[PDB]
Amino acid sequence: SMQEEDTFRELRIFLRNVTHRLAIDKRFRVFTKPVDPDEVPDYVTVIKQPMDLSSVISKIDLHKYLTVKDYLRDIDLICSNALEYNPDRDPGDRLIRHRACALRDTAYAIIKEELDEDFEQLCEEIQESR
Ligand SMILES: CC1(C)CNC(=O)c2sc(N)nc2C1
Ligand SMILES: [Cl-]
């Protein structure tokens, strides 16, 4: 219905806002663009499901997220990919893992505080009815 299209549009507006606040954070600059296969040739082979904040933005506009759960799945994916690909004890790896976890935590914290549970519930029930 027209009412349901309004709900998903509100969701997309909310998700764009959250993602923008993550993307401008200097700690998360590394997660703002896809991995360059030139600088990093073995990434695409090791990480089967690449994800970054620019791709998240693209998926929002393509109406790929009907719930915040769908959205958070991709956020978690950005984090889990970073932990998997950079697992060593060296400072370089430990820094990006720390930043990855901070990205995940920040996203969840923003949503915990600003997302209405009834709004999310409505999104889920509309989604489950399709
Ligand atoms: C450090 C880098 C070159 C490779 N290792 C990574 O974890 C990622 S994930 C991403 N979106 N960019 C990079 C850049
Ligand atoms: Cl909301």
Domain that holds residue 39: 1-130
Ligand 1 atom 6, closest CA: 82
CA-based torsion, 68, 106, 117, 119: positive or negative: negative
Atom of ligand 1 minimally distant from the CA of 86:
7
Q: How many domains would you assign to the chain?
A: 1
Resolution (A): 2.2
Distance CA(5)–CA(29), nearest Å, equals 33
Q: What is the DSSP letter of 130?
A: -
Three-class HEC string of 87-118 = CCCCHHHHHHHHHHHHHHHHHHHHHHHHCCHH
Any idea what the CATH number is for the domain that residue 4 is in?
A: 1.20.920.10
CB within 5 A of ion ligand 2: which residues? 115-116, 119
Closest to 99 (Cα-Cα) out of 76, 79, 81, 74: 79
Atom of ligand 1 minimally distant from the CA of 31:
11
Tokens of 124: 């889920």
Helix axes 2-23, 53-61, angle to 10 degrees: 170
Q: What was the experiment behind these coordinates?
A: X-ray
The CB of 86 under 6 Å from ligand 1? The reply is yes
**Distance between Cα 11 and ligand 2 center (Å):** 7
